[PDB]
């Protein structure tokens, strides 16, 4: 099953589970999967493994 990512607003430092770097910024720093909670950059979304 593919992930179901949504734009998310993080309130504590959160790293991208795909590429390892911090999700930088004040708002809308990345995407969170509705089902497994994975956090990724907007631009990392297309590159993550599709097994949720
Ligand atoms: C500017 C507001 C002051 C502040 O503390 O903002 C920090 C701010 C430094 C932050 O911790 C941020 C969360 C994320 C996600 O990875 C982005 C980062 O922004 C970022 O790029 C850096 C360097 C720290 C990160 C959350 C938010 C913007 C809510 C924040 O709040 C807290 O951590 C709560 C205290 C434990
Ligand atoms: C439903 C989305 C959350 C809406 C409320 C957001 C919120 O303010 O925080 C409650 C916490 C988790 O927030 P965070 O996930 O950014 O981490 C905790 C941050 N801090 C320690 C400073 C509180 O938020 C959650 O409950 C997590 C659920 C995530 C939705 C995905 C199905
Ligand atoms: C969803 C798209 C993400 C774009 C980032 C939007 C955002 O909230 O941040 C503004 C970002 C980048 O700025 P930064 O998040 O790098 O500055 C934060 C400074 N500090 C790390 C010390 C707290 O710079 C902008 O002007 C926008
Ligand atoms: Zn998922
Ligand atoms: Zn990333």
From TrEMBL:
Compartment(s) where it occurs, according to its Swiss-Prot or TrEMBL record: Cell membrane; Cytoplasm; Cytoplasm, Perinuclear region; Nucleus
Domain of life assignment: Eukaryota
Assembly, per entry: Interacts with PDPK1 (via N-terminal region), RAD9A, CDCP1, MUC1 and VASP.
Family: Belongs to the protein kinase superfamily. AGC Ser/Thr protein kinase family. PKC subfamily.
Function field: Calcium-independent, phospholipid- and diacylglycerol (DAG)-dependent serine/threonine-protein kinase that plays contrasting roles in cell death and cell survival by functioning as a pro-apoptotic protein during DNA damage-induced apoptosis, but acting as an anti-apoptotic protein during cytokine receptor-initiated cell death, is involved in tumor suppression.
Protein's recorded name: Protein kinase C delta type
Species for this entry: Rattus norvegicus (Rat)
Source species taxonomy: Eukaryota, Metazoa, Chordata, Craniata, Vertebrata
